[PDB]
Amino acid sequence: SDLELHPPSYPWSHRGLLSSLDHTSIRRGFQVYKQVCSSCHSMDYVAYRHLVGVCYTEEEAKALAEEVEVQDGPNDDGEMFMRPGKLSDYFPKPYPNPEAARAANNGALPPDLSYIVRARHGGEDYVFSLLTGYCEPPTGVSLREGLYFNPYFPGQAIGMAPPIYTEVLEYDDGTPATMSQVAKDVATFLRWASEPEHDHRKRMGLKMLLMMGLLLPLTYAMKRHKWSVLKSRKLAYRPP
Amino acid sequence: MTNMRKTHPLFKIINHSFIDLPAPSNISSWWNFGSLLGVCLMVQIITGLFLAMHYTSDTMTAFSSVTHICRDVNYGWLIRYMHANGASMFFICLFLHVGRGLYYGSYTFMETWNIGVLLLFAVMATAFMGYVLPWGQMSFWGATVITNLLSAIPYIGTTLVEWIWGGFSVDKATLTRFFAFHFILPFIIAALAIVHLLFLHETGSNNPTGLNSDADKIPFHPYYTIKDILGILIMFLILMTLVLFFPDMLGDPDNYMPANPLNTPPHIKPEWYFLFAYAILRSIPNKLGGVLALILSILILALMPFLHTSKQRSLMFRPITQILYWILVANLLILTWIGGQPVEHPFIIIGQLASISYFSIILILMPISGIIEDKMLKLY
Amino acid sequence: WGGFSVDKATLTRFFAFHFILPFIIAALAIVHLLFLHETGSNNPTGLNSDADKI
Amino acid sequence: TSDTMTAFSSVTHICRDVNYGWLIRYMHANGASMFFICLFLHVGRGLYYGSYTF
Amino acid sequence: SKWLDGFRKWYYNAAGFNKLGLMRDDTLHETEDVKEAIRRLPEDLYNDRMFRIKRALDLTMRHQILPKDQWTKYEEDKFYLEPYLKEVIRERKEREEWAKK
Amino acid sequence: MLSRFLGPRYRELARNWIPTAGMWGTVGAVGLVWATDWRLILDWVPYINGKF
Amino acid sequence: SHTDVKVPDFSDYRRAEVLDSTKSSKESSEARKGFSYLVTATTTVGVAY
Amino acid sequence: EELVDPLTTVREHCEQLEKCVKARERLELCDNRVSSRSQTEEDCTEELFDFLHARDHCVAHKLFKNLK
Amino acid sequence: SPTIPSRLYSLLFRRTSTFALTIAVGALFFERAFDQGADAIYEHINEGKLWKHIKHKYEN
Amino acid sequence: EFGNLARIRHVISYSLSPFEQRAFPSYFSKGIPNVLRRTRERILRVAPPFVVVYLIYTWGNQEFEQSKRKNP
Ligand SMILES: CCCCCCCCCCCCCCCCCC(=O)OC[C@H](COP(=O)(O)OCCN)OC(=O)CCCCCCCCCCCCCCCCC
Ligand code: HEC
Ligand code: HEM
Ligand code: HEM
Ligand code: HEM
16 A cells, blocks of 8 residues: 555664663564574574674573584585584574575565664564564455565565464573563664664763863863953054 | 064964964854864864774775774774764764855855865765765765766766776775775865965964954954853763763664675765755756756856845845845755655656756846845945 | 785785875875975086076 | 785786786886886996085 | 934944944955045045944954944944045046957 | 855956867877777878888 | 053953962963863873774 | 553553554444445545554554553 | 962972972873773663673573 | 965954863853744745645645545
8 A cells, every 4th residue: 555554653662862782672572583583584694603702601692603514615626515513603504594594484575684673664662563563464455375464564564474383492591471572672673683783882971972072161161261352352453 | 681582484374374363353163163164174084094003995894894993903893983973974064164155155255165065075975985985885875876976977978987987887996986085185175275274374364244354353362262161062972972971862763784796786976965866856857957956066166156136235234135045945854855855746847946956046036135135234 | 924824914904005005105106206306406517506507 | 905815816907808908007117127227227326426415 | 214214224234344343344345445435535535444444343243343432433423434435436447448449 | 065156257267268278189189099090090091001 | 642542351251260360370370371271181081092 | 461562552542542443433424424335436535544643653652651 | 287279289280300200100090090980970870781780691 | 375365454362272261151041042043033934835835735635535435
């Protein structure tokens, strides 16, 4: 349809000017991506070494990397072998090429969710409204098999099967894995994946604001002190 | 002994330009802006140099190299977003500088004005090719749109566009030559700005009153030096709160996808400093006429010295032409808003009225208003 | 190097530096010519050439 | 193209597929050599005729 | 009639140079004809013009104006550069019509 | 505002400068034809009919 | 005459330590110079940081 | 589900407002005028968008308070 | 007994070399103290969200 | 080219040292009336273009949201 539905603004914990991301939510959204979203979507620009100092220690991230297998080679005989993963490895693609991705998902290519927050209007609000907005189609429109009605998708007929539901996965910390909680955690994690510099950027911005609020009256006072010779200058004209 | 500042053959130029240059005492804060432009220019160059140290001009490894800059290079996100937001702030300072020149009658310096118009063309070409450079979706499709409207030229347009492209479409030859041209053009802009300052210093600078300022003149140091340091620090404040708090309020989200020739975006538009030009282009139902109107819009900005039909230089004492000037500025804002809109109701008629009023205010109504106040003040 | 040896980072930064250096060379050549033209040039005999200049 | 996997290949693409790209590349290399020839003779002339007093 | 004169006085107050102590003839952008007109001025009028321009620049620097009693009124605004300027334009037109023949 | 340039002396000056300007336009036309290898002109010159 | 010139009153612009015309200067010049140079020094510290 | 979704609770709380219920009878008149075999191309996309906009604005006002 | 800006000028600001020396000393003191205060404020805004607030349930 | 820019006769200028005078002498008390004086001089020339184009922007947005409605 020509008319479209805009996602609402949710009160995110990082929505403030100086507010940081919640790293427990990023960790929870990482395992939400791992046991659910990694079967169809790739993460070509995020490695396992990007998670250390953010959500996991080096031992936990090393165990996560050694859980999955990565093709590597070739050897001295000239063949590609199947080694365990390392910290430097990128996240494993579900499909080697987009053609088998379109074949496995019935024509539709599942996109790379590396900057899917920054590639869409609304950011993570769009992702949260897309994952928690799967509703039945209204009367007057007929939906063919293999398509699903999501009003936040452009054209309102998305090709993605509804991926999350209640207790779709189990959390390590005992959080109740409701559908909205899973969607919020994966939206926080995708926001981190699009902007990994976000916390450092906001800390640098706080330092910039404090330093420039210090510097501005001081250099204004210096400018006004040097210009007070001209600002207080008086003129007189006495022809004979 | 001697004075080393005035007798050294190298220090004499800096003494004549930035130390003992006679300047009007009553110039306002708008006179900071051009100096800020120069500072912003070198800032761009510095950031660009470091963005040249990790970027690969190749369609397989352009977007991946940009993501490698953003994620893996230490503070590479900071330098990249400083480069983009400083390009936007460079155009902000450009429009305010040109608006100062239009309002205060600084276009009577004809050689300086035409040299500045040449600088404006060069920086617009530099920013266009630089926006093509990261090879997103909007980069590829904006390059396609601009080169197609260049191909609208009869009988030489097709040959010129396939020679600019290096092929039958936008490909890696176009990307590499755009990287080379985007690299080399700011040094041409720097040399041209040196010529710009040379012509200004041999003709002198202008006060906001438009009167002869030789009665009250002050050295550049230490008044306008510290005033420009304050302006530089305010420009750094706005640039740093744009790079550190809202990195993407001016950017395009569709540029964060890899470039796909098979998929076209639902809406294709250039950046906000091209949007009024695009809205002027989109109004005329003739592609040759649209390109003609774009080039003659910037050329009637260049032609503005020859429309001065008033005995007073600045607009300080000309309120009717002041009103027409603010109508022109608001019309430019309207064209900027329309340029980011699709061709739907009621944007076509609004854009056509905006372009007609823009050309009428620049060409017709301003000399008429100048003649009207000339009669109205008993000048002739 | 940008690393432990010569690698891709070294090649990219050397391309950027090789691009940027000749323009600095051109500006220094302008300063070179300016410093020469302040005092005039030299003749092969080493004498004062002010008696015969063209 | 300034990437290690596509530097030598891009140079061969210049010399083999670009129209007169071999002329441009070998002109660049031999022009660098002739540039150093001119530079060495310029320096030696400055040394011989006492031009270092400037 | 008198309505046009009152409306001219309102525009004269709306122009704003009279709040800087300026006159109308000081606000002329100096071309070559105006430069020769200034060159032909007597010394007292030239000194008064230079002081008025300097005071206007000093007021515009401080972003201030004169008090309302010190504003240049519309009545005594003497047009001092008009006869010199008229003779300069007449002599230039004489040179122009000689060179066109 | 170019009404200064209406007169017999300027008319005589322009009349003197017509053939030099026409010859310079001929030079510019031949230079643009030669440097671009235009097929609309060199196919009419009898000697140059070998490259087309 | 040249003895007719008088400097106008700067009491609307003068500092708090130099308002009194009946007391000598140089007992407060170091304080004013220290204040101005302290402002300059703090600006230089911030710029250097 | 033994685990109760808080989003459903917030949604059914936000069906108790006034703009949502006015859009609800607007959608009701829409779908029984197009469900009466009128044989038209007209559907109920606009009414569904209005109701979903009101309901989702109400939900986004108070969704994240009860989520962890 | 003069004011503290008077003796501050007469001992620190009168000579340009010791002026630059105290600018450098105050610059290093200011960078240390300002980084302390800025990380303290940024820590105080964001309880329970940073990695250093939660690296004890997982570090072991 | 100081010393030959112009010719001025009989003009006396008095200036103070920057160290004998205040940096901000009556800052707010004589800064606020001057700001409102400049505002009163300039808003009737500056503001109504921006008011008019805000009206055009709001009317265009309203017509765009109305033009995508269903009926008729
Ligand atoms: C009266 C105050 C009441 C409130 C009291 C509070 C104080 C407020 C300030 C009081 C100021 C007192 C007077 C001092 C200021 C100087 C005089 C002044 O500004 O007067 C108002 C001015 C009169 O015009 P003036 O320029 O003086 O002279 C014209 C010749 N008659 O008038 C104007 O400039 C009016 C300009 C109107 C412009 C309307 C434009 C309509 C069309 C816009 C189209 C733009 C968009 C086009 C888009 C096309 C495509 C869609
Ligand atoms: C296989 C059943 C998938 C699972 C598991 C996930 N997604 Fe998906 N998604 C899938 C396909 C085939 C597509 C292609 C587009 C289409 O027509 O359906 C998508 C798309 C997305 C998008 C992009 C939406 C857009 O407007 O471009 C997003 C943001 C997205 N998917 C999110 C997402 C998340 C967060 C997942 C983990 C819970 C997830 N998807 C899993 C198929 C599949
Ligand atoms: C010689 C100096 C310059 C160099 C070397 C340079 C180099 C680059 C490089 C390598 C990029 C791509 C990096 C990236 O964007 O991810 C880039 C992007 C860009 N440059 Fe420059 N640049 C220079 C000067 C300028 C100038 C003067 C401007 C105009 C103000 C400009 C405007 C841009 C813009 C708009 C982009 C796109 C930013 C984006 O991705 O959104 N550049 N430049
Ligand atoms: C590309 C960036 C530009 C730079 C770096 C630049 C630089 C400068 C500088 C340093 C000055 C002197 C300071 C001042 O008075 O503002 C100046 C003045 C001027 N510039 Fe530019 N300029 C640029 C663009 C332009 C353009 C596009 C124009 C033409 C519209 C222009 C026309 C002028 C004029 C007329 C002046 C004199 C105004 C005056 O001093 O009164 N400049 N410029
Ligand atoms: C980057 C390469 C160089 C360029 C483009 C360059 C350019 C020039 C030019 C144009 C002249 C004036 C013409 C002439 O006298 O032959 C000149 C003269 C001179 N150059 Fe260089 N030069 C270069 C390298 C050097 C070097 C390396 C030296 C130092 C050994 C040097 C020292 C001189 C001297 C001493 C003169 C003046 C001697 C005379 O005029 O009699 N130049 N150079």
